[PDB]
Amino acid sequence: VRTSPTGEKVTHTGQAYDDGDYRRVRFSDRQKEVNENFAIDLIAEQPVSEVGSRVISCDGGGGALGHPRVYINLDKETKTGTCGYCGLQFRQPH
Amino acid sequence: GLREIRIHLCQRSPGSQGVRDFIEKRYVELKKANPDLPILIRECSDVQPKLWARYAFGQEKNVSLNNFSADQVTRTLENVLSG
Amino acid sequence: TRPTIRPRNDVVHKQLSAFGQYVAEILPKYVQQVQVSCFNELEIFIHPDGVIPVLTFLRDHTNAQFKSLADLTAVDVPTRQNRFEIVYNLLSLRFNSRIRVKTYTDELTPIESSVTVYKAANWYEREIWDMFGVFFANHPDLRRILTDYGFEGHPFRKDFPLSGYVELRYDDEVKRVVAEPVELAQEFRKFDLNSPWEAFPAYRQPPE
Amino acid sequence: KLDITTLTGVPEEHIKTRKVRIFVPARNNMQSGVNNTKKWKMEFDTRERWENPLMGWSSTADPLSNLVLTFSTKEDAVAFAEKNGWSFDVEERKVPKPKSKSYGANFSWNKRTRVST
Amino acid sequence: NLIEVFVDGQSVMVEPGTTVLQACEKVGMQIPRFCYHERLSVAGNCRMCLVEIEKAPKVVAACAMPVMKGWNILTNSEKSKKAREGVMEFLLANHPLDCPICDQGGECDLQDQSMMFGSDRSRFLEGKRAVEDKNIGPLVKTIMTRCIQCTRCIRFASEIAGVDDLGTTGRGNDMQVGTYIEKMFMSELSGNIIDICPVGALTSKPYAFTARPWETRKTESIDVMDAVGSNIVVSTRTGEVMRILPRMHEDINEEWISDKTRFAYDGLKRQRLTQPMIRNEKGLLTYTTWEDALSRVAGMLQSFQGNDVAAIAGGLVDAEALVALKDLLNRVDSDSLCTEEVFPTAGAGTDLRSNYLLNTTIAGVEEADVILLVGTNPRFEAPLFNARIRKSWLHNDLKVALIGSPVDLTYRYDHLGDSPKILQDIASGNHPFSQILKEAKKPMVVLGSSALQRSDGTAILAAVSNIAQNIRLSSGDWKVMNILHRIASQVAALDLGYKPGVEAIRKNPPKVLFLLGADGGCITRQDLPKDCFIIYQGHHGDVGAPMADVILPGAAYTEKSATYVNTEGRAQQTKVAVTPPGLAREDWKIIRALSEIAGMTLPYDTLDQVRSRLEEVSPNLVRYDDVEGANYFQQANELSKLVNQQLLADPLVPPQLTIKDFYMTDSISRASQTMAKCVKAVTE
Amino acid sequence: VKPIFSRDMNEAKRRVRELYRAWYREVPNTVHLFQLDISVKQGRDKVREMFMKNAHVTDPRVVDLLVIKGKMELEETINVWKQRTHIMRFFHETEAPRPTDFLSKFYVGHDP
Amino acid sequence: PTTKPPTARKYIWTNHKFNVSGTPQQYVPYSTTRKKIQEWVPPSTPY
Numbered sequence A: 001v002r003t004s005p006t007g008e009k010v011t012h013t014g015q016a017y018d019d020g021d022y023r024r025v026r027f028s029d030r031q032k033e034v035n036e037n038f039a040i041d042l043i044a045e046q047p048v049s050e051v052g053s054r055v056i057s058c059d060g061g062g063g064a065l066g067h068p069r070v071y072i073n074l075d076k077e078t079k080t081g082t083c084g085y086c087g088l089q090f091r092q093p094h
Numbered sequence B: 001g002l003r004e005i006r007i008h009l010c011q012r013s014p015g016s017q018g019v020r021d022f023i024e025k026r027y028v029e030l031k032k033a034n035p036d037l038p039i040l041i042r043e044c045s046d047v048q049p050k051l052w053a054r055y056a057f058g059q060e061k062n063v064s065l066n067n068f069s070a071d072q073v074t075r076t077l078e079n080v081l082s083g
Numbered sequence C: 001t002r003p004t005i006r007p008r009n010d011v012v013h014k015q016l017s018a019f020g021q022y023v024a025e026i027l028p029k030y031v032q033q034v035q036v037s038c039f040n041e042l043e044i045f046i047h048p049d050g051v052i053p054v055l056t057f058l059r060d061h062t063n064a065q066f067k068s069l070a071d072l073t074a075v076d077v078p079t080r081q082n083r084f085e086i087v088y089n090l091l092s093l094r095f096n097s098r099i100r101v102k103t104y105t106d107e108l109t110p111i112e113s114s115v116t117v118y119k120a121a122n123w124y125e126r127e128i129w130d131m132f133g134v135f136f137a138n139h140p141d142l143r144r145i146l147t148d149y150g151f152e153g154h155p156f157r158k159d160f161p162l163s164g165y166v167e168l169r170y171d172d173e174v175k176r177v178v179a180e181p182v183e184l185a186q187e188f189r190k191f192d193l194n195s196p197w198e199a200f201p202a203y204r205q206p207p208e
Numbered sequence D: 001k002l003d004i005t006t007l008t009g010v011p012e013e014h015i016k017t018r019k020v021r022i023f024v025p026a027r028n029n030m031q032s033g034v035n036n037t038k039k040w041k042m043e044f045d046t047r048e049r050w051e052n053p054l055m056g057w058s059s060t061a062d063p064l065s066n067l068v069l070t071f072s073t074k075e076d077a078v079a080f081a082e083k084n085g086w087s088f089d090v091e092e093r094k095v096p097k098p099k100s101k102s103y104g105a106n107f108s109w110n111k112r113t114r115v116s117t
Numbered sequence E: 001n002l003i004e005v006f007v008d009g010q011s012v013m014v015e016p017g018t019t020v021l022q023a024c025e026k027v028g029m030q031i032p033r034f035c036y037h038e039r040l041s042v043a044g045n046c047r048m049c050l051v052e053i054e055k056a057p058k059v060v061a062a063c064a065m066p067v068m069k070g071w072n073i074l075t076n077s078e079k080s081k082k083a084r085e086g087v088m089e090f091l092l093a094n095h096p097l098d099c100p101i102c103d104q105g106g107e108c109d110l111q112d113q114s115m116m117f118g119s120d121r122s123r124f125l126e127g128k129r130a131v132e133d134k135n136i137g138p139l140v141k142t143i144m145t146r147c148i149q150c151t152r153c154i155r156f157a158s159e160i161a162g163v164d165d166l167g168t169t170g171r172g173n174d175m176q177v178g179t180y181i182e183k184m185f186m187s188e189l190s191g192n193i194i195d196i197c198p199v200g201a202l203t204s205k206p207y208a209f210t211a212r213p214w215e216t217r218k219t220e221s222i223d224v225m226d227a228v229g230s231n232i233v234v235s236t237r238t239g240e241v242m243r244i245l246p247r248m249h250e251d252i253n254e255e256w257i258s259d260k261t262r263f264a265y266d267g268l269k270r271q272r273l274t275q276p277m278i279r280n281e282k283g284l285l286t287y288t289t290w291e292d293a294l295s296r297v298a299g300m301l302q303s304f305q306g307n308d309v310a311a312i313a314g315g316l317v318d319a320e321a322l323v324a325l326k327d328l329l330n331r332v333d334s335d336s337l338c339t340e341e342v343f344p345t346a347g348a349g350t351d352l353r354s355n356y357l358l359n360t361t362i363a364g365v366e367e368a369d370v371i372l373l374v375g376t377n378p379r380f381e382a383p384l385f386n387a388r389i390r391k392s393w394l395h396n397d398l399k400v401a402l403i404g405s406p407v408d409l410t411y412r413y414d415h416l417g418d419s420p421k422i423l424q425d426i427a428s429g430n431h432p433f434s435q436i437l438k439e440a441k442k443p444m445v446v447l448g449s450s451a452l453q454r455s456d457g458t459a460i461l462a463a464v465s466n467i468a469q470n471i472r473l474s475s476g477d478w479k480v481m482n483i484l485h486r487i488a489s490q491v492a493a494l495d496l497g498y499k500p501g502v503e504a505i506r507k508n509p510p511k512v513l514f515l516l517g518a519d520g521g522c523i524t525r526q527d528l529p530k531d532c533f534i535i536y537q538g539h540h541g542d543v544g545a546p547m548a549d550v551i552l553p554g555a556a557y558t559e560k561s562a563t564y565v566n567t568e569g570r571a572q573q574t575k576v577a578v579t580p581p582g583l584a585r586e587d588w589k590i591i592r593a594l595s596e597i598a599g600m601t602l603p604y605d606t607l608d609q610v611r612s613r614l615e616e617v618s619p620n621l622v623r624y625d626d627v628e629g630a631n632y633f634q635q636a637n638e639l640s641k642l643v644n645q646q647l648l649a650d651p652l653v654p655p656q657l658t659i660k661d662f663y664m665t666d667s668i669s670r671a672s673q674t675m676a677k678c679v680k681a682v683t684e
Numbered sequence F: 001v002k003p004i005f006s007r008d009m010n011e012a013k014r015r016v017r018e019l020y021r022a023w024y025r026e027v028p029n030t031v032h033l034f035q036l037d038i039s040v041k042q043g044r045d046k047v048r049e050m051f052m053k054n055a056h057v058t059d060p061r062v063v064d065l066l067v068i069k070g071k072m073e074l075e076e077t078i079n080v081w082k083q084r085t086h087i088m089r090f091f092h093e094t095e096a097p098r099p100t101d102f103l104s105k106f107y108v109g110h111d112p
Numbered sequence G: 001p002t003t004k005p006p007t008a009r010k011y012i013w014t015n016h017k018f019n020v021s022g023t024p025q026q027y028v029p030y031s032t033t034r035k036k037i038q039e040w041v042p043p044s045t046p047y
């Protein structure tokens, strides 16, 4: 969570009120609600799973408590396969 | 001072037959006689043929050419040219 | 077998069809069409002049004792010249059956009031007049119900926007609630949901 | 010469200053279905939409922004517009012209219609 | 010789060779399909078109089975429904569960046909297949895992686009569509594969994740990027343009739009002129109220008259704005109303409409036997016209010849050469192609507007008219003379009387120059007098705006209702999709407001009145979607011969030689980031 | 065509005259009862304006229907069904003047 | 919760905050999307 030049906390969306914008007045004696946890950083931090099959399935964990099951192709060595919903990354060993 | 002339005729209406005859026969001579005068020929539908003469400063006058023979159209255009 | 599909009762279908033919024979002056839906509901289509005669016939026992006006309403279909379709729902407690009578009208053509025959159609006709534009002739007291006292438009009319044209707020300058043109902070988002593929081939209209 | 304008209750600005478009909606080119192209539609002219200062939601002042009507035929829509006193523009229905399709043409001996794959 | 067939017992007369599906359309029944596109060739791989014919043991594919007399097509029999359910199940067996995140979601033929003709549950108890995604360019986001091998993309690329780079690799369930190599699918009509794809395997990268189909409001409009006049649907949500989709118009654009038309709307989101701007004391443009800037230009207009005040019209301006500005300048007795494109004024010029129109309409191209293209690259200048040419070439065996620089037109053509003298050679009859033209029953000659922009444009037009007159002498209803314009506003301006080319302004430098969206740069401050007062009225600030004393913000084609006339002479009206940004206003309203302030109030006060004025100036302008036209070739050719200009020896070279040129050709295209990305893609 | 209340335009005009009479005499009672701050003349002028709004109508049935609506509004005003807010809604006091010349409209907004 | 502890996740707050209405910590609504239309920047040179 970076801080804009005006001193506002930039959002994960990247939203920050410019110095010219008058809408910053709404936080004059109040606070701007910003979620410190950023999804992109946390999803980056997750280790890349290595699976020895060309096609793997990610349910997001928990079975019915996760996301619809999708099958990811891992043939490309250059780039790791990424779950559309979960965002976890997989690649074939070596 | 004439600035442009607009001629409106119907492609198949009987009223525009004379204007069509003027276009097919006399238009080439008219353009030769007045090389730089804009004589815009346009098609109008289910309305009487008309001749529009835009003078200096935007003043325009329209003369109905409905059921005019080619000679009558030539006379009308010549009168507009002479002023 | 076939648990999902609704069971069909043919006996009621035949009974309703026979009674519909009965009604058609008795009053051919007014009935234009009678049809029985496959969920066993009978509808009789009547010329606008026949609202009082046919309803009175249905109430009085020509083997029919429909003595209770279920509900009275209109359906505005703009395409038809008579954009309003006046709909009568009747229930016969003696024969434990219900039939529907339907008639049409325009914005400028009055329809005779049914207060005399049923007496329950007073408020129903008032609501029809207030929402739809239909005027009922010979009504004991035709005035607006369910709309504001000064309301100008006729809602439910398929032309009236859902948000209307006026909005009310309190104004401190005049110390009064004042109407103002509608200005929505979030425009109602129109969703185009109809699928490009036909769903029911049974109802396919002729190509024409 | 039917005029319901006085009786509708619509304010005069929308009666006079609005142009209503009568048309058959074109097929959404993303889909091959044609069921949504079989009925005439009446749609009003688009007006200003601005962002709400508080939340950025699109705000409007046009009451008839979302009003759309379905008509079986062009004449019915025209009659409705005339009776309501709305200036109307009618776009003629666009029908797919008949096409000549031959699976045999994909294997023409001398013509260019032969398909490489 | 109509034969009688029955669809569900209803008699329908169809011509021999009609497919079963077409007869079902004749009776109104839309047979479910996944591989059949009427524009494309028949393939018969979807298998969803399997319908039962009465008394026939085996179901047949409606898309690929010609009807036989006496056949009764049972479109809702149990066999037909069971076949549909089985095919749908096989399609959905391996298809990924990507509907929530697939951009196609909400407008997916697979989804709708599953809801209508498929089972409501899955018996597939095994793993699904997964396919590595292919990169085919910066425009089409590809998820091949969702592909159903409908082969629409392949057949489209082969037939319409003409680029044979997409194909099927492998066999069996492992068969994959896409380039076997890392090639990029580059073409004008490349974006149309996104539309043609039933599933979200091929989707729009700029449009990805932005919006869902049901949210969007659809507004029917006309494109302005080219003079083809393709009909489009502007999809807007919450007052913001989301995407541009093609709209079917069989005469103009069948179901396709150019890549620039499809993807340049992003330019409307950037470099917009939102407030009036006036030069301050330091010489810097500063935002000002409408009243102040309008008063400034009104005083300047009052001060000068005649040739002192002049107007230059850009490629993207509208007919209403044109006529408003024309009347305003005429009220100061100025006829120096000039377009940025040059059309030979000598001869009839703008006097006869047939002189500056594609007389043989785009639909006419199909009937033609021989087309001679002079100094034009139709693939880049008018992509849909080139697509029509290729369609005629593929189906009608059209013979095409080009006089100009050799370019890839996606179809084989005879390259006569690039020297203009070949026009004289054809006209005299020494050239062999003259004989082919004479033998041709329906010959067609097209002279691109770009060639006319050259110095020898008058001579080139005279030579082409000589070719056409020789053709007519050898052998009517058919028209052989056509001019292909590359700028939308050109035809309308010529109809309204705007003088083609900026030459008059060069002859008489004006004290006050009003730039109506003129970003071409033909005229600059150096050519003008030093103290020239320049007014710029346009949506984007590209070239004209930075050199303007007053900037009047104006609306774009998406933001106004206006009349644009295509190369065929067909007049079409755009419809308002979003409100003009900021303080910007519709152009004709701006001209009328300046007229009111300057004391010369134009008669029209509403859009309908402006259209009435257009009807006064040119009746064809208000006759929408009419290409009736008139034939005046005799008079124009006779006028042409009076002058004898000699063509220069420079070879005919189209301004656009490679697809890199096509992407950025106007203010909207230049502003777009997507077009810049495409330029980087092709260049690098 | 079936007449609502009048078979001819003249009869509808007679009904309009009656309705106008009734509104005219009711206006002072409305001012007194609702404690409105407008003058009787002002209200009657508004009545005249409202009546002239429908003057262009050239169909007897439409006139009759308008008369019915006028009668209903008059019954509301005669009773205290309408509040002071409803009565003053005729006088668009809060709403700001909307200029009608072209130049003012051009300045203010994109509206036609 | 002592008998059956809740599942431990990193994103879950470690200190529960009561209703903060009427306090400087009160939530203030605001748009979370960036500017849609970008205006032209006039050049800084006089000409």
Ligand code: SF4
Pocket (backbone or CB within 6 Å): E095, E096, E097, E098, E099, E100, E102, E103, E104, E105, E106, E108, E109, E110, E111, E146, E198, E199, E200, E201
């Ligand atoms: S393309 Fe496939 S994943 Fe996408 S919406 Fe259609 S069926 Fe669902």
Ligand code: SF4
Pocket (backbone or CB within 6 Å): E146, E147, E148, E149, E150, E151, E152, E153, E154, E177, E196, E197, E198, E199, E201, E202
């Ligand atoms: S990528 Fe799309 S268009 Fe191409 S074969 Fe697959 S489903 Fe068909």
Ligand code: FES
Pocket (backbone or CB within 6 Å): E033, E034, E035, E036, E043, E044, E045, E046, E047, E048, E049, E050, E061, E062, E063, E064
């Ligand atoms: S698309 Fe018709 S058989 Fe496959």
